[PDB]
Amino acid sequence: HLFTSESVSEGHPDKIADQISDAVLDAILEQDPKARVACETYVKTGMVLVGGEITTSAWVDIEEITRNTVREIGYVHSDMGFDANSCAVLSAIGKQSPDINQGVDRADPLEQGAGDQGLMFGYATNETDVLMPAPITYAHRLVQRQAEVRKNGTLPWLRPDAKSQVTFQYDDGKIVGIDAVVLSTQHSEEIDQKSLQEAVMEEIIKPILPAEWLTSATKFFINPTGRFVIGGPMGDCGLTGRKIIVDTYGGMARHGGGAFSGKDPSKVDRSAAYAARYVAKNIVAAGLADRCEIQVSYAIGVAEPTSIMVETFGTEKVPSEQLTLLVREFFDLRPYGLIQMLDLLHPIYKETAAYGHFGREHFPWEKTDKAQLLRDA
Amino acid sequence: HLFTSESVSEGHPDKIADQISDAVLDAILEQDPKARVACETYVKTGMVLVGGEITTSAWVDIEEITRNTVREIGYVHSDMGFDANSCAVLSAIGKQSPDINQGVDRADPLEQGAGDQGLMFGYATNETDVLMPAPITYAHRLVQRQAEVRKNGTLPWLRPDAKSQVTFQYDDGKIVGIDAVVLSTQHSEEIDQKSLQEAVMEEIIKPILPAEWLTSATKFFINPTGRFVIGGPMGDCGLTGRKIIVDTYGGMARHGGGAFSGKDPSKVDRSAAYAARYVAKNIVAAGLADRCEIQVSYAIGVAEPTSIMVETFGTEKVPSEQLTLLVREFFDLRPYGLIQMLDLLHPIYKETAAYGHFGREHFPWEKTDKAQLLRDAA
Amino acid sequence: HLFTSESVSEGHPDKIADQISDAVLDAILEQDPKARVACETYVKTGMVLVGGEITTSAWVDIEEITRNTVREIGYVHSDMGFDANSCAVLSAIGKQSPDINQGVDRADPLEQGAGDQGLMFGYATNETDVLMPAPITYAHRLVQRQAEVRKNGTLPWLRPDAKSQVTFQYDDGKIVGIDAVVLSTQHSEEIDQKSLQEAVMEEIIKPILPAEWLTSATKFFINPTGRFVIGGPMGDCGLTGRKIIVDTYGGMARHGGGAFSGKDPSKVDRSAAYAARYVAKNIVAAGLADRCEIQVSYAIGVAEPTSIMVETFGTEKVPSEQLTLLVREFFDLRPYGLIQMLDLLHPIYKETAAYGHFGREHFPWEKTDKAQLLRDAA
Amino acid sequence: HLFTSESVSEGHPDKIADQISDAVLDAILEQDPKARVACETYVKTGMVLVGGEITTSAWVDIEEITRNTVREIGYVHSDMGFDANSCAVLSAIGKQSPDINQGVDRADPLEQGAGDQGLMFGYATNETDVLMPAPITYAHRLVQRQAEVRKNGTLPWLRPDAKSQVTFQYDDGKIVGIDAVVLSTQHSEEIDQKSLQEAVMEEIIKPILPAEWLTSATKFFINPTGRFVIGGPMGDCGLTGRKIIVDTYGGMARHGGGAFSGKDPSKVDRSAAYAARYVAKNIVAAGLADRCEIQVSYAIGVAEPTSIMVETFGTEKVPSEQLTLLVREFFDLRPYGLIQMLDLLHPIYKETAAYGHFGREHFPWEKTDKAQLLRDAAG
């Protein structure tokens, strides 16, 4: 069978919004680790609207945070369709509803109730070194490489907006090759399409995709519209939380529907999904399964989860029901437990808002620190 | 194992946005079936912002469409925190990028290119009469029931914002029961929690959930914060395309990340996901599989898909690669082919923007009209 | 001849905007008296947009200030068309341009430059005890009376939005009577027009206007479209700085065009118009003229005014050249000096933003503490 | 004595707002001459918000009108701080309240009610050929000149945002000279202050201001903070109706407070101020006074003005009681009549939204076609 996963650069309008949302979250947490933040960002031709519900003792400069974020992304001139230095920054930030907060923050700190209801999924598969699905990891690297080539001036005619897509060929449940690649990138008007296609293939795609998976029958589509000068917020509206699949496992695993960026750890949409990646990775790391997918769910203002489910796809190396009640022993999945487990009350979330929340070494939910102590029990 | 799906009422802030987006799409398509529409809606305390990229010959009243939509949902008074008749309606609507239209609308009509790149999933499972996963269909019915009991005045203290969550117990791959239920609903200040919990238990949950699946160990969580007076856009920002899982299969199937509402059929994020539901359902209806999950993908401005994948979870009733072989013969999955297959150039999409896009008889992608022809060529 | 002036209530949309701008200003100055503030507010159905240029070390809660200000005004329910508790509050506040600031905050505070170029008028007349023109005085009193009988419950069907207008008859420079009165007020649907008109007459108009100026020839126009249920920002957009004649002299005197509200005192549009009122009032209180109009002008970044003019309409008691010299001697009109002269670096401005900036004698620019000095020096 | 007036260029943010509001009005009136339009515009860094109350059968492209208007003004690049092609255009346009409209559009068109209450002034003076005060005339000419030499490429480092101010010396009611001139203009970073100041002197100030009014005593203030690179909406919020003295008589005459731009002629704030200029100009052109100030006032939903006043500052050549009678005999100041008198139901307003509503004699309220009639009836 064929399988396909996509990713987007830091300049894609939805990722701009995600990044602004987590930039504001970060600034707040630097001052107020216990702040309640639900930051939703809307980006369109000429304007950033930052809104949502925040309850904090912190004082942050929404305008300067936003301009700085768009500046680092690279939109700094009207020729690119968007300029960090001259766009509108609007705030529509209110307070968190008192009807919600009475369910989260309560008497005993360890009794903290879930921020909301909802379902979250985690996933891990041994087919890569970082225990991630291959299609989404190489999609991320393709767009991450585009931004690095753009920023270090190797291809100065590049623009921030870009998307990648890769369609892998599988057999025996293992990678055979790559049947199709797509790399669409915004560009200045100076460069013709033929020069751009060759530069993308040589400088973007070949350094990232192992040539074994590439054949003469491997199909390539580079700016297949034939022109990508208009881009960023000018050609497409950007919204926080509209890339939740490229944020996670590229469609290789199911999703509960919860967005990540702009949300402080009290939101189980984020903190549970990180903890679900945490256990599913460790479970694989201990060789107890080849592939593992966890589903947890919560009720509003209720500490204990309402559902836990371990799925091994017929690859378990110990009975599945032993695997389930071992998750329950070595991981605390109540809201207060998620935050303690992963050391989450820190400004570490802007770095997550582009190129995937999962599969990066240093994230606390990526550490394989309980791998050994899984076997022993 | 236990599996959990959720859904939200038409009054949930994200669904308000989805509904406004598709309400605008509908008005446009009624005048201009060929319009290019990408309508993104942002709703917060006191305001609706309608934005996006539209290229159309149609003239529509964004303000009145929006107020009328919020009216029908039920926010018609400041006591509820939001009033269709006095909120701000802002428009930030631009034109579609010329660099994209040159890849969609090109030369031959049947050589039309995909609206974007992306991946889309479809799904069907025989475990319900409408071939949908059970958790998401009963989730949808719980909030759909909440809106109907609110609107016909049986529980007049109900307010439009509501959510449901059901935890099903599976084993043998079959439904054992329901281990947990959640029904959070916005309410007037008149009624206390005990009275509300009883009324929700009696008028909401019991008429909808088969009593067999309820035991006495079945947990019930009703307004578990203890108060749900503040609600709608006042308590929670609402955005178009932020309920893509409750829009589809409640997490039972994978998702490609594409939102549906506010998008005209030239966006493969919508029309392909509808066509993948179409083929995955008809495949099950022909008895060729018990459960079937389809993945297709496209490259922007390219007619033919870049990937097709039929996954039957080991429940196939014919060889797997003959099942992929037949999808490619009796279904045209190029952009123009999707639209012809399902007759999508019609104002039918507002009805989809709440209570699921899948599992409702009348949608063109729910017809079981190729079921027999798939068993023939099998 | 006939002369007409108008005023508007604290609930008129433009005055809502002025009051929010100056509420924000006051909140900042309480923490940072030397803040640079140019706060512009836009109010329309369902939303308040607070924008402008602010450089300050203060932190103020724009949302809470706005809601509290709109609450005090009385818009607290969707039936009124606007609700302080559920409207959107958006911010678009930037920083003051450093290109402007280097001209204002120079190294030497004594050389503080004018915050902009421009011209400003001050006026006084011994026609009333507070040395204001009579038409604007009584126009303010009518809308202040409307607000009082609304707020104290006398006429609870009144809504916050209202306007007044009075046409006076003059003969040989003296008021002889009132020729026409207009009073428009928003109201609930519960009251019919004829009953409203009688109540406005008895409770608003007759207690405020002197009876000896009202005759059988006086025309009274009360809600003369026949209906005023829709009002506030729903019926009419409100913007800061769009009531500058109501704010000053009601058309009796000239105006240089600069708005007041939302501006810190380094904006000479505000501080130099207060100073010009101060010198005009003190000239008339000193008995040196019956009527006095002062023009002053500035260049941005320059301390010394570009012009000063004293106009007394033939009423002067000492030569006009003497009066102009007395103004130079007794008043500092450089920005540093006038801010110190009037003690302007305090949170005193929200109070000015409805019912007129002049004629209320606890304002520092209304003190006549230089009148005896001027009478002596002349 | 000294008297001062100011003006602003088409690129000043308040004037950007006035021009967008009147461009919207014109686009609507081209399709629907009887539309009810109250279009209010707010411009700040990166965004234009077009709002207000409009009832019309026209459809106009608000975005395209806004972008085209800002392009014509000259903000077309982020280096300038504002870009017509990449700024946000938001709409918050509602409908006119039917409670207002039932008072305006009554069954009998002759009984058309005033769009609001309010007071309006008109003014004329034989100080200049167009019968306007000299200070606002020359202040307008300075910023018009700034825009001209920016636009024709003479001084290409000029940017659109600019302001002027002139202080005239009067002696016995005549201009004797100019005491001070202010000219502030946004500019690119490529030019230094002293070079800019000399270029502004030579190319903007000296070709416009009479040389006999400029002496060694005249003070010249050119970009007196020392830098004006940040400008336009980035430096200063723009709002419709925040230049109403620049729009009219530069402070020489009184004002009733109503803004002009974005309003259709049923708003007497605009149409009755145009009418008041028309009757004042015709009185002075008829030779019946040297300067003349008219006040008119209305009640909302009422056709007959609540007051009319004729002030001639002692310069009248016939009794002031007779002048007021001539005004009532020769001018119709009811809303129906004044809209007919000045033929106001046409897309003519965008042109008014910068460089002043008065003094430009192709406008219909600038015609002196009643002066000879007034001259006859007075004797």
Ligand SMILES: C[S@+](CC[C@H](N)C(=O)[O-])C[C@H]1O[C@@H](n2cnc3c(N)ncnc32)[C@H](O)[C@@H]1O
């Ligand atoms: C703009 S498209 C979606 C279609 C759009 N909403 C419309 O109005 O039709 C979404 C993404 O595709 C990318 N994109 C935009 N223009 C493109 C072009 N000419 N070629 C390839 N990719 C493009 C951008 O990263 C953009 O965010």
Ligand SMILES: C[S@+](CC[C@H](N)C(=O)[O-])C[C@H]1O[C@@H](n2cnc3c(N)ncnc32)[C@H](O)[C@@H]1O
């Ligand atoms: C708690 S959530 C998201 C968290 C929120 N953004 C915050 O500020 O923390 C809000 C959503 O859940 C529902 N909700 C809001 N308040 C609720 C309450 N007291 N009890 C149960 N559900 C509530 C509403 O449908 C609303 O859309």
Ligand SMILES: C[S@+](CC[C@H](N)C(=O)[O-])C[C@H]1O[C@@H](n2cnc3c(N)ncnc32)[C@H](O)[C@@H]1O
């Ligand atoms: C909150 S900060 C002051 C913090 C700063 N570190 C200090 O104390 O000097 C004030 C700046 O942020 C901007 N600002 C935006 N919103 C503001 C708000 N509600 N209150 C105060 N300043 C605001 C203004 O441009 C203002 O100059």
Ligand SMILES: C[S@+](CC[C@H](N)C(=O)[O-])C[C@H]1O[C@@H](n2cnc3c(N)ncnc32)[C@H](O)[C@@H]1O
């Ligand atoms: C609404 S009117 C201005 C014209 C209006 N914007 C339109 O669309 O025609 C301006 C002010 O007049 C007052 N007003 C509103 N409705 C009124 C009514 N029905 N009768 C009398 N005055 C009214 C309110 O104070 C309002 O702010």
Ligand SMILES: C[S@+](CC[C@H](N)C(=O)[O-])C[C@H]1O[C@@H](n2cnc3c(N)ncnc32)[C@H](O)[C@@H]1O
């Ligand atoms: C009614 S018109 C469309 C004309 C239509 N044929 C009719 O007669 O009803 C559009 C209405 O929506 C509002 N509107 C919003 N945006 C508009 C726009 N760009 N152009 C004209 N009207 C607009 C106005 O209140 C206007 O009355």
Ligand SMILES: C[S@+](CC[C@H](N)C(=O)[O-])C[C@H]1O[C@@H](n2cnc3c(N)ncnc32)[C@H](O)[C@@H]1O
């Ligand atoms: C920006 S200033 C007014 C006060 C300003 N809002 C503040 O924050 O202090 C008003 C007008 O003066 C002009 N202006 C802006 N910057 C200027 C500068 N550096 N020098 C001279 N004039 C300037 C522009 O026409 C601007 O619209």
Ligand SMILES: [K+]
């Ligand atoms: K208005």
Ligand SMILES: [K+]
């Ligand atoms: K006078």
Ligand SMILES: [K+]
């Ligand atoms: K300003």
Ligand SMILES: [K+]
């Ligand atoms: K005069």
Ligand SMILES: [Mg+2]
């Ligand atoms: Mg998107």
Ligand SMILES: [Mg+2]
């Ligand atoms: Mg969610």
Ligand SMILES: [Mg+2]
């Ligand atoms: Mg949401």
Ligand SMILES: [Mg+2]
């Ligand atoms: Mg998508």
Ligand SMILES: [Mg+2]
């Ligand atoms: Mg107004």
Ligand SMILES: [Mg+2]
């Ligand atoms: Mg000013």
